[PDB]
Design a protein around this ligand. Structure first.
Ligand SMILES: CN(CC#Cc1nc2c(N)ncnc2n1[C@@H]1O[C@H](CO)[C@@H](O)[C@H]1O)C[C@H]1O[C@@H](n2cnc3c(N)ncnc32)[C@H](O)[C@@H]1O
Ligand SMILES: CN(CC#Cc1nc2c(N)ncnc2n1[C@@H]1O[C@H](CO)[C@@H](O)[C@H]1O)C[C@H]1O[C@@H](n2cnc3c(N)ncnc32)[C@H](O)[C@@H]1O
Ligand SMILES: CN(CC#Cc1nc2c(N)ncnc2n1[C@@H]1O[C@H](CO)[C@@H](O)[C@H]1O)C[C@H]1O[C@@H](n2cnc3c(N)ncnc32)[C@H](O)[C@@H]1O
Ligand SMILES: CN(CC#Cc1nc2c(N)ncnc2n1[C@@H]1O[C@H](CO)[C@@H](O)[C@H]1O)C[C@H]1O[C@@H](n2cnc3c(N)ncnc32)[C@H](O)[C@@H]1O
Lengths: 259, 259, 259, 259
């Protein structure tokens, strides 16, 4: 079927990509990087994140597969030595598809973004102060370095370093964590991470400065004259092609405990 | 309809209970503490926790209501001055019912328990060492003070003090948090809180000592010759009688930010 | 004696400053903002921080006094209504002097800085990776948002929001805290805050990118072609003019617990 | 000189102890476990902790040496294969002595205790509530699982698992850390670890229940009718016999980062 392969760009990944293309030539597989039905990422989690955003407008028609030649490879569930077995199983097809929830970010002044890991907000230089509104209800005034809204699969990423909880991706939710919040007699935040279900809307509203540095996964953009930053669980989902059992908690164990 | 009222036992609660019973006498409401359809708790969260466990074998036939004369009152959404308005609205009925997930705890040597807040495990004196098995997969060996498995509505309770995240109760899940885990070159745990969906089973298995102090909400029991402690989201749910809008996040805001 | 008064610049502080100058005119007090022996700061902790850096080259000849018209005022131990009593006590003199330790920061490419609160390091855009060398011994490779080295009196400031401990200022030391460190199977940091005594030298050395954003208290400067960032307890100390008992732990209690 | 050797009691330690005694027989070294000038501990940190408390009334006349046959061995700076080299260097003598600060705990109803790692307080069953008084000044009312007061060398032990900072042992100080404190609209603690210098006195005073479980390093004792628990840096110090350079931060690196 229609497929494409992205590469980290280094020697090991560029070479591995060519061998898989040569192997796919022995089957009824057409290379097409415009409308691929299967996107193969060869590299690290950053490479996989690039492949996702490269095709984030055809997520309902694409199944992703990660091969890690990098260092950690959380979204990758294939080693380079297993590449030929992956080519054959992919050709036969009839695999299983697994879907992870995604995060929608809306910035009004309006631009929308889609995240696989998380979306964070910081100030453009001065102090960061925003009012946190949950479902039109004012919840807190946050003063600190910033805030991080994570997907379930993103909870093992930036969310984890901020003290957030690790969520199983079958839970359609988003998690808000704090970055170095000020808490004294005058300033007060919840402190704890917050896990929101589907259809809950978290809105960040400026207090004084209206310029923020907003990141969505890898890319980070300076936004000016911001009136509102809106977070919610996206209706879109990323789809993985799973050819064997690799449970999320074993993936967590192998990445943080021992492998 | 059939109802009963439990009281913290102090003067303000005992007196308030009598006035509500007298007010219910003016309607078609029968007092029955054997098969009540509505259980009213007058006191704090501990009193409400006692009322829940007093009727934990008729949860599918009971709607709970909390009136706080105590200090914090997280499960209570009524002030004592609103008691007469609650009597009338309760008599007319046709309110809305809201369900929160519960935690099932199984201790094999077999006894099962039901928690509204959380269930924790500690050692009976010596060091606490357990293997954490998730869905038959060994995830980690925990060494520390203990572990805490919380319900969604329990995340604002002991779970919060342990650094856990606050979850909305519409999310059918349980959250495992650590108590002072040892982490060095030799010993290693995930550190982060873990949020598990329905049908996931977390099993604690002893390494040396087999005696543990197991708590379920308020009650704490010493268990001997323990072979396994099993956690999972219960199939049973607690039902609340809601007569107005009191969102969970506003309940959180009023309890931790300001009220 | 020779004195000067700095002001937050708002109406309440500008007016209060003029009244104190008028009151000092009734004594043998000469206003001199070139070589003052007593520097009075009227405003918040940011105003006091500005006054300190304005005279950081005459710290051995200056005693500082803080009057808070702002919001929190941690370095201030005088309310505006007590200003006239402060003028009289200051004129009579013979007060007690109290010294807090300071932090020295050296940036080699060489520039040195002096901090009253803390000095932090972040990346200039890309990922932040530095080797942490303690007394010429390689301790760890840090990957994350950045690092924060705090003075004792600065431990209640940025250091506190990063999970650091609060130290009494009689302890000549500095405290290093982490900002969102990456910790997995591959990357590993100590996690815990580190408290270093006098004459211990903490050195940050770049791994790839050599451009860092270095902050010293309020000011934040972009440094290019950095070869080393060096932290150590300074030999210089800030001196306060104390006219009554205001213990550090009561100052902490009033700022975070209740006042 | 006069010496004694304590052993973990297992086969490897019991055998290693006999070989060192046989080696010491070739020098002018007299075995004496009543008034030893040098105490050698063969085992883990628990064995070393037992040796310290076994001779805590002759600390000014004893230098300690740790040999680790156990798992981690933080207070040990000798491997079993280096035992013969240790015997020779010990016989020649003229080594360097290094002193670490200790913690004094006073329990009034009066009994005093000496700690090398830490002293902790928990409740005897019910909820733990104590008023924290610092230098006769009421600082906070603590509600939670308990409190932990650590020595400098103990900061890498229980103190570390509670989020406390790691302090260099040249700093004569003690560090108080919290165990799962309750913090809401009504209950409030500092949250942060507190580092106290010499001559500062931290006093815990009961609010309702007067029975506490008090631990000093390994031993844990139930105390009844407690009126006050008093913490302060002890005037006594533990002395180590150091035969080479093993800096504290390298000891920390080897125990937590990699070795
Ligand atoms: C460019 N990065 C690609 C990625 C990823 C990644 N995704 C996961 C994941 N889902 N689960 C587990 N590990 C993951 N990694 C792994 O992140 C580690 C370093 O990035 C590598 O080990 C990846 O293998 C962007 C990511 O940088 C993260 N980040 C940004 N600052 C961070 C910070 N201070 N602390 C923690 N994360 C941070 C942030 O999540 C951002 O999206
Ligand atoms: C007897 N207690 C009744 C309750 C409750 C309660 N439930 C909630 C909730 N769901 N959300 C928000 N607050 C809650 N409280 C509020 O807990 C506070 C003190 O107990 C009061 O302010 C209650 O009002 C049992 C509970 O003690 C808790 N606990 C046990 N040690 C705890 C600890 N070290 N730290 C934190 N919690 C602890 C534990 O949860 C146990 O179930
Ligand atoms: C411009 N600021 C002036 C100051 C100060 C100050 N010093 C103390 C202190 N010693 N003890 C107790 N409170 C203090 N404040 C109080 O800080 C609060 C907000 O700044 C106000 O309530 C001050 O009253 C610079 C300071 O911003 C701090 N900062 C920068 N980001 C921070 C962050 N994310 N989290 C926490 N602190 C941060 C950082 O320390 C920096 O030096
Ligand atoms: C019986 N123990 C002997 C000791 C020690 C020890 N001392 C240090 C040290 N100074 N620095 C670094 N590691 C150390 N260990 C190492 O502690 C680890 C396990 O005990 C082993 O790896 C030791 O090698 C008593 C100690 O148990 C500790 N403890 C009690 N519960 C604890 C907890 N939940 N979390 C953390 N510590 C705890 C507590 O400190 C108590 O004194």
């Amino acid at each position: 079927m229609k497929y494409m392969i992205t590469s980290k760009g280094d020697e090991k990944s560029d070479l591995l990509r060519l061998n898989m293309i040569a192997g796919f030539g022995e089957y009824d597989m057409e290379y097409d990087d415009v409308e691929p039905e299967i996107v193969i990422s060869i590299g690290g989690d950053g490479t996989f994140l690039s492949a996702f955003h490269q095709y984030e407008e055809r997520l309902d028609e694409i199944a992703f597969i990660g091969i890690h030649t990098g260092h950690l490879g959380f979204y990758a569930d294939w080693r380079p030595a297993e590449a030929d077995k992956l080519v054959k199983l992919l050709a036969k097809g009839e695999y299983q598809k697994v879907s992870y929830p995604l995060l929608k970010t809306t910035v009004k002044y309006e631009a929308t973004y889609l995240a696989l890991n998380e979306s964070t907000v910081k100030s453009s230089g001065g102090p960061f102060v925003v009012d946190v509104v949950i479902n039109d209800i004012h919840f807190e005034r946050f003063r600190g370095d910033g805030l991080c809204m994570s997907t379930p699969s993103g909870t093992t990423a930036y969310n984890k370093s901020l003290g957030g909880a690790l969520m199983h991706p079958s839970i359609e939710a988003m998690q808000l964590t704090e970055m170095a919040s000020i808490n004294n007699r005058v300033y007060r935040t919840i402190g704890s991470p917050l896990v929101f279900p589907k259809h809950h809307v978290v809105s960040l509203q400026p207090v004084n400065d209206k310029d923020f540095q907003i990141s969505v996964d890898h890319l980070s953009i300076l936004h000016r004259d911001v009136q509102e930053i809106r977070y919610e669980v996206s209706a879109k989902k990323i789809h993985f092609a799973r050819f064997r059992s690799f449970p999320f908690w074993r993936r967590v164990h192998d990445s943080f405990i021992e492998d």
